[PDB]
Write a protein that binds this ligand. Sequence first.
Ligand SMILES: O=[As](O)(O)C[C@@H](O)[C@H](O)[C@@H](O)C(O)O
Ligand code: NA
Ligand code: NA
Ligand code: NA
Ligand code: NA
Ligand code: NA
Ligand code: NA
Length: 245
Amino acid sequence: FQGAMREAIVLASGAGKRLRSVTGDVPKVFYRFDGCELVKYPMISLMKNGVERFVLVVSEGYRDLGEKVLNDLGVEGIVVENKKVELGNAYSFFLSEPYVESEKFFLSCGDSLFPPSALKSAFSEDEFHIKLGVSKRSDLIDPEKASKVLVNENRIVKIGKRIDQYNYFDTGVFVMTKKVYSLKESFSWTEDISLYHVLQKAVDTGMIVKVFDFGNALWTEIDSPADLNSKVYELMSKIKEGVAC
Ligand SMILES: O=[As](O)(O)C[C@@H](O)[C@H](O)[C@@H](O)C(O)O
Ligand code: NA
Ligand code: NA
Ligand code: NA
Ligand code: NA
Ligand code: NA
Ligand code: NA
């Protein structure tokens, strides 16, 4: 009982302010690094895990760019425009609700870089509302960029940026279920809400919040010019194997 998940939500609506010196006017998610748009790398790893439909969330004004990404990869999807980018990536996630056609689906940040085997342990049909991809592998990640997770067995105990006890990093990849959308009304929406804050709220409201381990898979989040290096280029090469991105 390991079932493939055919659908993924990909969040591709951030500014990418810290990478502006490299990307200029173009949002980092649609800028090419090693010859593919950054957003294509998590999309390809998800397609290599059986995903066949994306809900791609972009900022107001980039529908075209989102559509080109889907055409290029030859994959089905719908592009959804986010008119409130200042409400954070939790808002980008809650926007996807009307568009999702499955009970259980992947969610990935459009700037999380990971190879297809990172998701190998994500397929257990166990009981959960959220399952976060976590890793201890830290050679690539900037530990100021990733949120930190205290895990006991496979449960999230606590999660955030400034937490004083933690054993894993949040990779920006998740398995979500439709029950997660019921948290949309639990925030005031007068300030930016991050996805890790949604997980912390899930724990605080009695949901089952679990993790799957990336194990030894190379992974990172691309936020600043200093995240780009030879090891990241070799991870991009790996993800693109056998694909004209
Ligand atoms: O992908 As998460 O770390 O769960 C939440 C993301 O929204 C947050 O904005 C980032 O700072 C992140 O990297 O922590
Ligand atoms: Na990010
Ligand atoms: Na542990
Ligand atoms: Na549900
Ligand atoms: Na937050
Ligand atoms: Na944040
Ligand atoms: Na890993």
